[PDB]
C-alpha cells in the first residue's frame, strides 16, 4: 500500500508539474504518457484492471500519439513567440490553481467513505452486462457521438 502508493502519487504529481511547467511540448506530452502509465498502475492497484489496459492502449497509444503527429507536422515547440507575456498571470494562476483544489479538498476533508467493495478486479467479464444493458443507451449515444465527431472533423478540414 503506502510504500508504493507514495511512489505512484509522487510520480503522478511530478508528471503533472512537468506537463504544466515545461515549455517543451514534446517533453510535456511525454510526461503525460508517463502519467498515464503511473495512473494505469494505480487503477490496477484500485482493482480497476480492464480500464487501465484501455487507458494505456487508447490514451497513450492513440490520443497523445495524434497530439505528437500534429505537433511534429506543425513544429510548435518554441511556443513563446508572439508573447503578450502577461507575467502577473503566472503566479496568479497558481493562486487559482490552489483555489480550485482547496474547495475540492473542503468537500473531501472530514469525509470518511466506504472503500470496501469486492470488485474482484475490474475485468470486462463483469463490465459487459453493464455496458450492454444499464449502460447500452449511453453506449449507443457515444457511438453516434463518435460518428458525428468524424463527420465534423472531415467537413471541418476538407481542403477544396
Amino acid at each position: 500500500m503506502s510504500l508504493l502508493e507514495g511512489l505512484a502519487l509522487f510520480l503522478l504529481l511530478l508528471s503533472g508539474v512537468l506537463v504544466v511547467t515545461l515549455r517543451n511540448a514534446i517533453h510535456a506530452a511525454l510526461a503525460l504518457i508517463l502519467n498515464f502509465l503511473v495512473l494505469a498502475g494505480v487503477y490496477v492497484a484500485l482493482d480497476a484492471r480492464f480500464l487501465g489496459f484501455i487507458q494505456v492502449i487508447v490514451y497513450a497509444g492513440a490520443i497523445v500519439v495524434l497530439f505528437l503527429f500534429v505537433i511534429m507536422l506543425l513544429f510548435a515547440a518554441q511556443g513563446e513567440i508572439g508573447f503578450d507575456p502577461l507575467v502577473r498571470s503566472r503566479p496568479l494562476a497558481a493562486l487559482l490553481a490552489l483555489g480550485v483544489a482547496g474547495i475540492l479538498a473542503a468537500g473531501l476533508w472530514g469525509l470518511d467513505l466506504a472503500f470496501t467493495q469486492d470488485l474482484k478486479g475490474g475485468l470486462p467479464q463483469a463490465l459487459g452486462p453493464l455496458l450492454y444493458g444499464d449502460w447500452l443507451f449511453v453506449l449507443l449515444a457515444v457511438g453516434f457521438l463518435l460518428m458525428a465527431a468524424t463527420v465534423v472533423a472531415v467537413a471541418l478540414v476538407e481542403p477544396g
Binding site: 502577461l86 498571470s89 496568479l92 494562476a93 487559482l96 483555489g99 480550485v100 474547495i103
Partner: peptide
Amino acid sequence: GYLRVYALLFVLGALLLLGVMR
C-alpha cells in the same frame, strides 16, 4: 478578447460561486 482573460475570469467566478454555496 484574449482567451486567457476569459478563462481566468471564468475560473474566478466558478470558485466564487462554489464558495458561496456553503
